[PDB]
């Protein structure tokens, strides 16, 4: 049938003026593993630009995981690839494929690649992706006008979620919010709308769209007090009663001012830890070969904290093991050394050479509690 057949590295050895001037048709891409991805030209042009670190090493295999549409696999039965959704292009999605490329290079050659070269190749690949996508895409500009509001507003399922609403926290926040939440996730209704396609791509939040296209519900005061009567209208069709506009006036500015004033008071908490953690010092790679391994009980909430460690089983670098979730486990930590890379874990290979590990651990602990408030 009429599907052209390309390769994984034969598109990567192609020049930019020849990659962008590809035909617009449904084609096949052969990868170095035993799979074949069905996709279109506008997605594989974006996937090749995420394989910039793979362009330097010309003997590295390119698996099928590197493609954006890696769910469509050309199998024997024709219904497993006929009507299948693809991967959604996100601001996080283009980063994880460059991550997949740099760790494919780091896993192809066995642990002998300086990660500084991989990080420089990652920032250079992001720079080349930016410099290609801004220049070559100058007619595909997302606009917003009066017509875009009147397409999400005029939907009959959104207008049904504004009439006959029970003014409590249940009848708003579980019925009227959900009646438009289940249609905002429908990939059939809003084709080409700049608001909905930006919501699906992670650039818009639904928590701000619920207060705009549906009812706003129960704002607070200087202290968290519900006012026993919710706001009747949203932000698209405005709010022009004295009661509801005064409650939204108490919710708007005074909350954000004390979400501003409570972030320079936490600046004292991390400096003393940042100064006291500098006693531990430089991290040299290798293996200390010490028979000192501490036992640690595993819990479901600390499984993600064991994402990079060195398991010892019958004399293993993952964080997705659903099992081993209640068993106490013996593995090596920094409490035994004669600090090595195996004892600290595989988090230490993302740290540069001249960086104090206790100082960067104090910064990693400090930023997480300020990212919540």
């Amino acid at each position: 049938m009429n599907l052209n057949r390309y390769k994984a590295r034969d598109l990567l050895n192609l020049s930019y003026d020849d990659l962008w001037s590809l035909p617009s048709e449904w084609h096949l891409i052969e990868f170095d593993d035993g799979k074949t991805v069905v996709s279109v030209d506008r997605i594989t042009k974006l996937s090749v630009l995420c394989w910039y670190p793979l362009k330097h090493y010309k003997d590295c295999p390119i698996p099928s995981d590197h493609h954006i549409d890696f769910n469509r696999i050309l199998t024997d039965n024709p219904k497993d690839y006929l009507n299948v959704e693809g991967g959604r292009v996100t601001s996080k999605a283009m980063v994880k494929h460059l991550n997949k490329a740099i760790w494919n290079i780091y896993d192809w050659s066995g642990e002998t690649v300086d990660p500084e070269v991989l990080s420089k190749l990652a920032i250079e690949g992001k720079n080349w992706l930016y410099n290609q996508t801004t220049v070559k895409l100058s007619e595909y500009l997302a606009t917003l006008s009066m017509f875009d509001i009147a397409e999400v507003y005029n939907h009959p399922k959104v207008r049904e979620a504004n009439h006959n609403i029970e003014p409590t926290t249940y009848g708003i926040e579980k019925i009227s919010y959900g009646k438009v939440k289940e249609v905002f996730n429908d990939p059939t209704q809003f084709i080409g709308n700049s608001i909905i396609e930006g919501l699906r791509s992670g650039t818009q939040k639904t928590e701000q769209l619920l207060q705009a296209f549906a009812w706003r519900g129960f704002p607070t005061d200087i202290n968290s007090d519900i006012f026993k009567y919710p706001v009747t209208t949203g932000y698209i069709d405005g709010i022009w009663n004295l009661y509801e506009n005064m409650i939204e006036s108490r919710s708007g500015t005074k909350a954000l001012l004390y979400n501003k004033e409570l972030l320079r008071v936490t600046e004292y908490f991390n400096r003393k830890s940042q100064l006291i953690a500098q006693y531990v010092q430089r991290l040299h790679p290798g293996d200390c070969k010490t028979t000192i391994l501490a036992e640690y009980p595993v819990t479901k909430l600390t499984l993600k904290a064991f994402k990079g460690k060195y398991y010892q089983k019958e004399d293993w670098i993952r964080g997705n093991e659903t099992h081993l979730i209640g068993t106490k486990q013996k593995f090596r930590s920094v409490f035994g050394c004669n600090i090595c890379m195996t004892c600290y874990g595989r988090l230490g290979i993302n740290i540069p050479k001249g960086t104090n590990i206790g100082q960067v651990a104090a910064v990693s602990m400090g930023d997480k509690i300020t990212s919540a408030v």
Partner: protein
């Protein structure tokens, strides 16, 4: 859900009543809109808003200006720095002070009224005072004036009662690369219309320690500071200063060395190169019997000081003439008393008493104090903040030419490019209604211009409108079209100008400028999205929704794929509110002198191998 009714009038919103669609904007941006006004300087291109409320007719009544306090009669009209045809004749006098006597009073009180050329309550920002010509020509030493008669208004207050707080800009909503992290892509022809005026002041002191240098003059004259009406030097040095040394007098006290400014060992005062000089005030301590200023240098200081001393002597003579007539019946205003205290502080004392030791906030004067006031306009290029009369502000990051801007298929050139994707994030939806209704009204005015025999994007002459208005059957059709458009988005207007006498002047006013002005009060019984759906689903009053051609970051004329709508937004400009070696290169002067020597003896000043 009570969509059509509104129950908040103009007296419950303090400054929120200045803009419509306040309920569609979130309160965190609705407070930022009020914080942004009062931080906006007055720009050279001022106009009333296209969407008017009642508030702009009331805010134009209470502004800083010159005003007669009571019913008074003028006694004496003084003027500093008299202008004429002579030799020491300073052109364009700044200050003209009149003296009035309060009529209709038991005790006829005597006051003064300073009329300057400008007013400035902020540092490096101000505005000028446009004089009322029909009243300023009437000023005579025997004239009667009423209460609250206003001379020297500002430029924001129009003759009809409106306030100019900004300028309308054609705003296009695109996702271009320039609009990253609240960025603007401004037009070059639009940034000329947003040009604030800055009034600054430089202060000189040349006495026992130092003298002035011979800038601004040839080998025949000595002119240390520019005159009133003279511009500043292309490098903005005003009154450079060199110290007293008599052993270096063949070296430094030479007409070559006095005309040449050495940027080290001297003290220059730097300002704006292109700037007219407005006012000069010189204070002289003339009670020293040897003068440390050498001969031939005070030819320009004495010229201003004698004209200031004659004014301060005439004022004291006027007060002492009023004192001899009404003994112990004088009652004077509190400003008039301090003006005579200033006049007695300026003039020299007789030798029977001690001389004055004049200061300026614990800073002693030494025989000369020059006070030059200049005025400079500032063109915005980069890092200038703007606001669209909502909470959404941004920094200008890219300026393009007028032909490299977005343009519709009708011919409307864009002035700004704003990222639309922050509207859902910041929840300021009044911008959308302003953009859409302004686009619909502007396309209505341009379409009504096109149906008559005229040309869009051009102000018609007075002989074309006299032939357009001559056909009575077209003015009625255009008035019915304008009324049918006002029936959609502003029913208060449709109720308040169905009772219209002389309807031809309304169509003549609409066809004159490029927009029909719209009254949108804070309580208007209209549904916003029903008006949006009425504008979209209609044969008439529908804005032009088509594609937009522009010039991208490379050299190419590209046309966008999406249908993009261009509409006006009332814009305003806002004011601008190892390691041991690097530490040893600053905390040790020998290492800094070695870095300077390594920079200055090298073959290449950049790419030095090692600096000690």
């Amino acid at each position: 859900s009570q969509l059509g009714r509104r129950e908040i009038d103009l007296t419950l919103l303090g400054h929120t009543g200045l803009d419509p669609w306040y309920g569609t904007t979130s309160s965190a941006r609705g407070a930022m809109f009020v914080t942004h006004i009062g931080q906006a300087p007055e720009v050279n291109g001022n106009e009333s808003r296209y969407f008017l409320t009642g508030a702009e007719l009331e805010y134009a009544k209470y502004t800083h200006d010159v005003r007669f306090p009571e019913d008074c009669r003028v006694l004496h009209v003084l003027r500093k720095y008299p202008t004429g045809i002579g030799k020491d004749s300073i052109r364009s006098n700044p200050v003209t002070t009149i003296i009035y006597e309060n009529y209709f009073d038991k005790y006829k009180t005597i006051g003064v009224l300073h009329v300057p050329e400008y007013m400035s309550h902020h540092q490096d920002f101000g505005y000028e005072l446009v004089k009322n010509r029909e009243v300023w020509e009437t000023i005579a030493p025997n004239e009667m004036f009423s209460k609250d008669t206003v001379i020297a208004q500002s430029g924001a207050v129009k003759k009809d009662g409106t306030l100019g707080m900004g300028v309308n800009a054609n705003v296009v909503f695109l996702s271009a690369a320039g609009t990253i992290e609240d960025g603007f892509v401004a037009n070059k022809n639009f940034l000329k219309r947003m040009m604030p005026t800055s009034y600054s002041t430089a202060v000189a002191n040349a006495g026992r320690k130092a003298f002035f240098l011979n800038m601004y003059g040839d080998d025949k004259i000595y002119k240390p500071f520019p005159d009133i009406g003279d511009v500043i030097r292309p490098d903005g040095v005003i009154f450079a200063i060199r110290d007293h040394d008599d052993d270096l007098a063949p070296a430094e006290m030479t007409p070559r060395a006095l005309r040449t400014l050495d940027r080290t060992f001297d003290r220059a005062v730097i300002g704006t190169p292109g700037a007219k000089v407005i006012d000069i005030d010189i204070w002289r301590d003339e009670r020293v019997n040897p003068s440390p200023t050498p001969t031939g240098m005070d030819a320009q200081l004495v010229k201003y000081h004698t004209h200031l001393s004659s004014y301060y002597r005439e004022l004291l003579k006027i007060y002492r003439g009023l004192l001899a007539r009404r003994k112990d019946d004088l009652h004077i205003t509190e400003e008039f008393e301090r003006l005579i205290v200033t006049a007695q502080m300026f003039l020299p004392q007789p030798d029977n008493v001690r001389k004055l030791s004049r200061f300026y906030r614990l800073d002693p004067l030494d025989e000369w104090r020059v006070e030059v006031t200049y005025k400079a306009q500032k063109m915005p290029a980069g890092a200038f903040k703007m606001t669209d009369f909502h909470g959404g502000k941004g920094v200008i990051c890219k300026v393009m030419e007028d032909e490299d801007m977005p343009i519709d298929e009708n011919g409307n050139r864009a002035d700004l490019i704003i990222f639309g994707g922050s509207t859902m994030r910041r929840s300021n939806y009044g911008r959308i209604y302003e953009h859409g209704f302004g686009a619909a009204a502007r396309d209505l005015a341009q379409r009504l211009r096109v149906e008559a025999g005229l040309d869009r994007h051009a102000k018609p002459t007075q002989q074309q409108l006299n032939s357009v208005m001559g056909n009575t059957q077209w003015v009625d059709y255009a008035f019915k079209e304008l009324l049918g458009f006002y029936e959609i988005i502003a029913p208060t207007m449709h109720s308040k100008m169905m009772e219209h006498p002389n309807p031809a002047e309304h169509v003549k006013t609409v066809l004159m400028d490029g927009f029909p002005y719209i009254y949108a009060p804070v309580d208007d019984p209209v549904d916003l999205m029903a008006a949006v759906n009425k504008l979209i689903n209609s044969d008439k009053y529908r804005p032009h929704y088509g594609k937009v051609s522009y010039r991208d970051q490379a050299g190419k004329w590209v046309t966008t794929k999406d249908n993009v709508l261009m509409g006006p937004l009332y814009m305003m400009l806002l004011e601008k509110i190892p390691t041991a070696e690097i530490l040893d290169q600053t905390n040790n002067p020998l290492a800094h002198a070695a870095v300077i020597e390594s920079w200055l003896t090298a073959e290449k000043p950049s790419s030095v191998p090692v600096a000690v």
